[PDB]
Structure formats: structure tokens, C-alpha cells
């Protein structure tokens, strides 16, 4: 595995990301975790593809260019921006609007998302 | 395994953050991955737990009392700051401080930190 990797359970429901690569394989309820490879699912680019604005002090992230659903069955789960050596995740629960706010000093940046139905995401400014 | 706990694959080097939650064990390299759980480990506190300054806008987080070495095979590999629904990371590499500023507005934050020698550890202000 290599670091920042998102991996899945398609048993019991684990997801975890990669702080430090190794070389073993991730196992979970007797089958390889999924590499939840970015821009993979076949699912619409208009509410998944993140959306990056640059502001004062940092950015403001919006999922996706058409707002995409908060619902308790249907929702992005979490936001994060990435830097060359930063990764700052912001959670989120149905309800609230899927966007996030992050106050950062990175010129190039990488927005990803994760929709509990449609996968991983992500855009670079 | 719950959100933000870090697990470690013996023999086979991965680290890995959780991002959601469940039931599975998570398995690599022939065993179940070893939870680090923070503060647990018997190392000199003065240089591994995290000591969190209020700035302006944020937070410094130093590592520690006593500023742990950054040596090729003894140092601090990553630095965090969490809050509300925020898990912000900065990786670190030998040659630079065991230091790291997070931009953030939450007046209540976990600070951890962890050493590829002696394990997790973690502060709160
Ligand atoms: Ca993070
Ligand atoms: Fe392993
Ligand atoms: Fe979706
Ligand atoms: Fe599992
Ligand atoms: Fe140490």
C-alpha cells in the first residue's frame, strides 16, 4: 500500500487510509481490502467531482460542482484537502451541506470525497 | 475498529488511520493489525507527548517538552490536530522539527504525534 490510500471492507464496513505504505496486504473479514481507486465508480462528475475556490488563508471545498445529497442512506461522508505533505480530513453528517473549509498555506492542493454509494473523488486546483 | 484509530501491521510496516468504523479485525501479514493505542508505551514523555500552543488563527504543536530527535531511523512521522469532526495530519521526514502548525478554529483540540520507534501518543488542551 502506498500512503493516503483509501481502503474498504466490503463486509463489515471498515475504511481506513494508508499513513505509512509497508509492503503487506490489507485484509478484513477474510478478503483483500478494496483500493478505493479516485474518479473509478461510474457515477455522475456534476455532484461527485469535488470543486475547489481559493479564499483568504486557504480553500473552500463544495462536492460536487451541483450540489451533491446529505441524506442518512445517501451522503459525502468526508472531504479532505491534500498538500505535498499535509492531509487535513473534514467529516461530515447527512443534513449539513457538502462542503468544507479549509484554512491552509499550499499553492497546489488535491480535494478528494467519499460518497458512502458512489466511492472516492477527486480534483486538484 | 472506531474513527481515528491508527493500526500498524507487524513485520510488514503498514500504518493505517481508520476514516469510518465497524467490525471486522483488520489483518495483515498473517496476524490482526496492532492497534496503537496512545500513551501506552514506555518512553520518556518529555519528548513524546505533544505540548499545544494557542496561536493566532491556530494551533503550534511541539513534540515535545523536550523536542524529540528527527534522525533517519528515530523520528516523529506525523503530527495531528483534531477537533469537532477535523483529523488535520502533517507527515514529517527526518532532517526537520518535530513541529507543526494547524489553522484552525476550535477552541478544544487532541494533539497527536507518532514515533516510528516508540508509538502514539497524544495531548489535549
Ligand atoms: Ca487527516
Ligand atoms: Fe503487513
Ligand atoms: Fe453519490
Ligand atoms: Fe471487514
Ligand atoms: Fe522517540
Not at 491534500?82 to 443534513?95: I, R
Amino acid at each position: 500500500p502506498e500512503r493516503l490510500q483509501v481502503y474498504k471492507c466490503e463486509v463489515c464496513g471498515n475504511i481506513v487510509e494508508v499513513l505509512n505504505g509497508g509492503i503487506g496486504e490489507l485484509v478484513c473479514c477474510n478478503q483483500d481490502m478494496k483500493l478505493m481507486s479516485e474518479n473509478t465508480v461510474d457515477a455522475a462528475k456534476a455532484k461527485h467531482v469535488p470543486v475547489i475556490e481559493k479564499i483568504d488563508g486557504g480553500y473552500k471545498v463544495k462536492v460536487g460542482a451541483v450540489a451533491h445529497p446529505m441524506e442518512e442512506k445517501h451522503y459525502i461522508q468526508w472531504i479532505e484537502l491534500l498538500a505535498d505533505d499535509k492531509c487535513y480530513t473534514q467529516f461530515l453528517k447527512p443534513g449539513q451541506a457538502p462542503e468544507a473549509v479549509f484554512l491552509i498555506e499550499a499553492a497546489k492542493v488535491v480535494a478528494r470525497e467519499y460518497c458512502n454509494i458512489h466511492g472516492h473523488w477527486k480534483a486538484e486546483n
